[PDB]
Design an enzyme around this catalytic site. Structure first.
Site, PDB file in Angstrom:
ATOM      1  N   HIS A 253       0.804  -1.211   0.000  1.00  0.00           N
ATOM      2  CA  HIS A 253       0.000   0.000   0.000  1.00  0.00           C
ATOM      3  C   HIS A 253       0.832   1.253   0.000  1.00  0.00           C
ATOM      4  O   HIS A 253       0.236   2.326   0.051  1.00  0.00           O
ATOM      5  CB  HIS A 253      -0.973  -0.012   1.180  1.00  0.00           C
ATOM      6  CG  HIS A 253      -0.333   0.214   2.514  1.00  0.00           C
ATOM      7  ND1 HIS A 253      -0.143  -0.801   3.430  1.00  0.00           N
ATOM      8  CD2 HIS A 253       0.116   1.346   3.106  1.00  0.00           C
ATOM      9  CE1 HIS A 253       0.411  -0.306   4.523  1.00  0.00           C
ATOM     10  NE2 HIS A 253       0.589   0.994   4.348  1.00  0.00           N
TER      11      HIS A 253
ATOM     12  N   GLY B  53       3.408   5.856  10.388  1.00  0.00           N
ATOM     13  CA  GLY B  53       4.775   5.691   9.955  1.00  0.00           C
ATOM     14  C   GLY B  53       5.393   4.351  10.300  1.00  0.00           C
ATOM     15  O   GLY B  53       6.565   4.119   9.967  1.00  0.00           O
TER      16      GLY B  53
ATOM     17  N   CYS C 188       4.215   1.165   9.450  1.00  0.00           N
ATOM     18  CA  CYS C 188       4.039   0.077   8.502  1.00  0.00           C
ATOM     19  C   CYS C 188       5.378  -0.338   7.899  1.00  0.00           C
ATOM     20  O   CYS C 188       6.261   0.492   7.616  1.00  0.00           O
ATOM     21  CB  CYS C 188       3.069   0.483   7.389  1.00  0.00           C
ATOM     22  SG  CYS C 188       1.288   0.526   7.852  1.00  0.00           S
TER      23      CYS C 188
END
Ligand SMILES: COc1cccc2[nH]c(C(=O)N[C@@H](CC(C)C)C(=O)N[C@@H](C[C@@H]3CCNC3=O)C(=O)COP(=O)(O)O)cc12
Ligand SMILES: COc1cccc2[nH]c(C(=O)N[C@@H](CC(C)C)C(=O)N[C@@H](C[C@@H]3CCNC3=O)C(=O)COP(=O)(O)O)cc12
Lengths: 297, 298
Positions: free
Chosen positions: A38, A140, A142
């Protein structure tokens, strides 16, 4: 206590990946960077993105991978379920010995929480039976990974993707497969109702015994099938054959049969604690595996 | 909201193994000095009550066996600063980080990197207790393990492990060899002073719990600072200073709950128990998160 693996081998593998203005964390092993797919999303993308069509519009030169502020040039890209794999032109000289593994619920691992490819913290987590973890993650985070270390080989098992409305966390293995029924969309998803990790409660009772706290040891035994029917009635996980087998070492060490211990936990479930503690707690602890008990002890 | 340690990689590159005779422990290798507890030079017979200086004059540089992974470092000198042995070696640690030696004040937290035979094994967060012990996790061969904080690439070493008390809490020194507390590097059974609870940390932890949605302990009452300290002292909690009140500002600004409001909440927890409820999953009031730990995590 909760104890994380030393994180230095994973720290030397964290990088950042940027698509436009979205920077996630990435995992740089040999000449491949692994990150959540993503990163190729922007705001209008996210409700239900078309990762296929989104990755078609992508070229190698759209991907800014940085180890610090040093750019690594991308020479290939592909999608594997929910992880993007970016081939870079430099093999990471600090690549440790490693494997990608899919863990089972109940198993523990350490999380190296990172922001902008910069490690921030390390802590021990347990994969809940509803395939969530009770982690600590801000925006922040991920791409942060979870892992075990066995004989300086790193077993990567978790990449972080999501925080659920209930505050718990969800992600994939390093092949991009989610643990649980979660999808990488900007969507309020609901976890299955959690249950207590029975194999871990048992391990913790063994550690109590190893340390001299054994009042709860009873004189009875049970079949595994009778315990699994009584356990589900208290929202405890049923025991698998693999569960009994990894209880083996603690069984041999204390002399206590796995199924006598099961009959001892059953009593604790039907009659409670009686204002009595076990290893100092009023509650049964379920996020130490038998490995963690043996690990220290 | 979990107990979080600093990434340990910067310290891992510095741990080595130090062996004299039949005793082995961990040392810390910065630049061209290896730091380790001094009782590594002790025989079994010595450890009961030894003269450390005469034990050290009778030492040769070649009897020290320092192993950094697979390479043996050569000791070209030695000295003793309090309970810490300083081993000068012919090689400088190329992976030496920006670092400093700090003496931690009670209530402050740090990360412990548990090591054995110079190999890192685990990392976790501890607090310097009021009675200058730490509730560590340490086994045989852990002596020389270090505690530290990292603040923007700089490592601040604050603790080296020496001792486990009969009660199972632990004792050690700063990296200048001075014990935290009234302890000595002897093989004797030593008790600490009576411990107390770190009040400002419990309040930071209550603030943490609100930020994570747990609110059942909040109330409408308020208290003066002094009327809170009278009740805190009664329950073996450290007093609250104005400085502590100020450090908690960010959390109180963040949550809309004045500090003296959270104190009335804590006072009622102390006087009524928790009635079988839980806060951030704990049945006990947690006092090993400082306000900085909460701020940095939330
Ligand atoms: C309607 O919407 C919702 C409703 C109710 C609950 C919801 N939850 C999510 C979600 O979690 N969404 C993922 C991205 C998905 C869409 C792929 C996300 O936000 N992940 C964060 C980590 C998160 C953020 C803070 N703590 C974490 O664990 C990163 O890893 C970096 O994302 P950033 O690009 O840095 O903001 C969306 C959502
Ligand atoms: C009569 O005696 C006693 C009675 C009652 C309680 C007692 N406690 C101690 C003690 O703690 N003694 C330090 C050494 C003294 C000389 C400073 C030690 O025994 N051991 C560890 C760290 C320890 C090991 C277990 N958990 C740890 O934290 C090292 O690592 C170094 O020594 P070793 O490598 O194990 O030989 C002695 C003692």
């Amino acid at each position: 206590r909760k104890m994380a693996f030393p994180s230095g081998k994973v720290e030397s593998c964290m990088v950042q990946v940027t698509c436009g203005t979205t920077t996630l964390n990435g995992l740089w092993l040999d000449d491949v960077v692994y990150c959540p797919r993503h990163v190729i999303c922007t705001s209008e993308d996210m409700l239900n993105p078309n990762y296929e069509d989104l990755l078609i519009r992508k070229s190698n030169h759209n991907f800014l991978v940085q180890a610090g502020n040093v750019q690594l040039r991308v020479i290939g890209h592909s999608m594997q379920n929910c992880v993007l794999k970016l081939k870079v032109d430099t093999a990471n000289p600090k690549t440790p010995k490693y494997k990608f593994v899919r863990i089972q619920p109940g198993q523990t691992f350490s999380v190296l929480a990172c922001y902008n490819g910069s490690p921030s913290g390390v802590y021990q987590c347990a994969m809940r039976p509803n395939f969530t973890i009770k982690g600590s993650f801000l925006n922040g985070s991920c791409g942060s990974v979870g892992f075990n270390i066995d004989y300086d080989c790193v077993s990567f098992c978790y990449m972080h993707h999501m925080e659920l409305p209930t505050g718990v966390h969800a992600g994939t293995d390093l092949e991009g497969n989610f643990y649980g029924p979660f999808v990488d969309r900007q969507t309020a998803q609901a976890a299955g109702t959690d249950t207590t990790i029975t194999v871990n409660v048992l391990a913790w009772l063994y550690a109590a015994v190893i340390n001299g706290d054994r009042w709860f040891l009873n004189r009875f035994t049970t079949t595994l099938n009778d315990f699994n029917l009584v356990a589900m009635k208290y929202n405890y996980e049923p025991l698998t054959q693999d569960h009994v087998d990894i209880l083996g070492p603690l069984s041999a060490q204390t002399g206590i049969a796995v199924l006598d211990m099961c009959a001892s936990l059953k009593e604790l479930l039907q009659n409670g604690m009686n204002g009595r503690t076990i290893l100092g707690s009023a509650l049964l602890e379920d996020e130490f595996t038998p490995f963690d008990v043996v690990r220290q002890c």
